[PDB]
C-alpha cells in the first residue's frame, strides 16, 4: 500500500526548521498531547476586552459558547475570566428571554 | 514422505474456532490460530478415521490406501476443513487482537 | 492564566490501575486479514496465497508467535520516589 493515514504522518510547514526527531512517532504523539485551542484568544471576541453583555442581541456570536442543545459551556471549556463568564452567561440568558436564542 | 507432508499441509485447517467461557454470560466463539504440531494432529485423525472405513484387515493396508487416495486428490476430509474455515470466517469479528 | 490546581499534602501519590499498552499479536492480525481475504475473494482463492504463507510462518512453532508477552508500568515507583521532592511542600 502506498497510502498512510494523516494521523501517522507529520506535514512540515514551509519556511520552518526541523530536526530529525520531527519525522518520528514521538513527534506525532507529542503534538497530540500538547494540542490546545490557544489560537482562540485572537479569534475569541470575549477574550479581547469587549463586554459580552453588548452581544445580547447578536445570537450568532453567543451561539459559539453553547453546546448543540443550548447549554452554556463551563468556564473550564470557554477559558474566559470570571467576569466575562459571568457577563457572557447573563447575555445568553437575556437573549433567551427576548426570543432570539 | 513428501507426499505425506504435502497432504498434511493441505488437509489441516489453518485456524479453528474455540468456545471460551469468558463471563457469566454465553461463551464466545473466537477463531484461534493453530501451530504445525496441532495442525498435523487434526489432519492425522481425519486420515485415520477415513482409513478405518476400508476393507483390509491390516491397518497398514488401509492406511496405505487412504494416503494414496489423498495424494491423488480424493479425500472426504477436505469437506471437514472447509467447514472449519467457514465457521472461522463467520466469527472473524469476534477476534480480539488485544 | 490557565488555572493551576494544587493538591493538599497526601499520604501517597499512586495510580490505582496504571494503563499499560499491549501490542497486538502479529499472528492474530495475520489471521484477521486472511479471514477477511477469504471473505471477499473466497476461501482458498489464489489472492490470499501470501497471507496463508505468512500465517503459517508466524504460527509454525507457537500459534500466537514468539512475542515479548510482558509489560509493566513503573509510574508508581517513580511517583513514590519523586513525590516528596516535587510536591512543593513548605519547609519544616
Amino acid at each position: 500500500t502506498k497510502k498512510i493515514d494523516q494521523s501517522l504522518s507529520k506535514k512540515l510547514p514551509k519556511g520552518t526548521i526541523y530536526d530529525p526527531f520531527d519525522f518520528s512517532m514521538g513527534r506525532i504523539h507529542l503534538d497530540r498531547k500538547y494540542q490546545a485551542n490557544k489560537n482562540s484568544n485572537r479569534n475569541d471576541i470575549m477574550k479581547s476586552g469587549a463586554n459580552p453583555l453588548e452581544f445580547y442581541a447578536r445570537p450568532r456570536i453567543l451561539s459559539r459558547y453553547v453546546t448543540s442543545t443550548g447549554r452554556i459551556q463551563h468556564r473550564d471549556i470557554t477559558g474566559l475570566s470570571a467576569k466575562n463568564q459571568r457577563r457572557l452567561s447573563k447575555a445568553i440568558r437575556r437573549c433567551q428571554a427576548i426570543g432570539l436564542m | 514422505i513428501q507426499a505425506l507432508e504435502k497432504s498434511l499441509d493441505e488437509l489441516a485447517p489453518l485456524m479453528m474456532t474455540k468456545t471460551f467461557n469468558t463471563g457469566v454470560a454465553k461463551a464466545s466463539v473466537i477463531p484461534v490460530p493453530l501451530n504445525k504440531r496441532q495442525r498435523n494432529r487434526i489432519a492425522w485423525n481425519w486420515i485415520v478415521q477415513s482409513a478405518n472405513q476400508r476393507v483390509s484387515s491390516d491397518f497398514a493396508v488401509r492406511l496405505g490406501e487412504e494416503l494414496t487416495a489423498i495424494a491423488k486428490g480424493t479425500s472426504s476430509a477436505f469437506e471437514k476443513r472447509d467447514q472449519i474455515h467457514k465457521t472461522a470466517i463467520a466469527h472473524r469479528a469476534y477476534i480480539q487482537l488485544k | 492564566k490557565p488555572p493551576v490546581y494544587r493538591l493538599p499534602p497526601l499520604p501517597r501519590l499512586k495510580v490505582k490501575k496504571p494503563i499499560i499498552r499491549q501490542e497486538a499479536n502479529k499472528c492474530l492480525v495475520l489471521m484477521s486479514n486472511l479471514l477477511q481475504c477469504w471473505s471477499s475473494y473466497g476461501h482458498m482463492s489464489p489472492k490470499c496465497a501470501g497471507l496463508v504463507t505468512e500465517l503459517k510462518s508466524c504460527t509454525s512453532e507457537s500459534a500466537l508467535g514468539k512475542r515479548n508477552n510482558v509489560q509493566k508500568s513503573n509510574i508508581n515507583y517513580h511517583a513514590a520516589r519523586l513525590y516528596d521532592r516535587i510536591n512543593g511542600k513548605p519547609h519544616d
Binding site: 518520528s24 512517532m25 | - | 497486538a24 492480525v29 484477521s32
Partner: peptide, 25 residues
C-alpha cells in the same frame, strides 16, 4: 534522519494493519 525514518516506517506499517483489522469489526 534515515535512522528515524526507518523506525517510523515499521510503526506506520504496523499501525496501518491494526487499524485495518480493528476496523473490520
Amino acid at each position: 534522519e534515515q535512522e528515524v525514518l526507518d523506525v517510523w516506517e515499521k510503526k506506520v506499517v504496523e499501525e496501518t494493519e491494526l487499524m485495518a483489522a480493528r476496523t473490520s469489526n
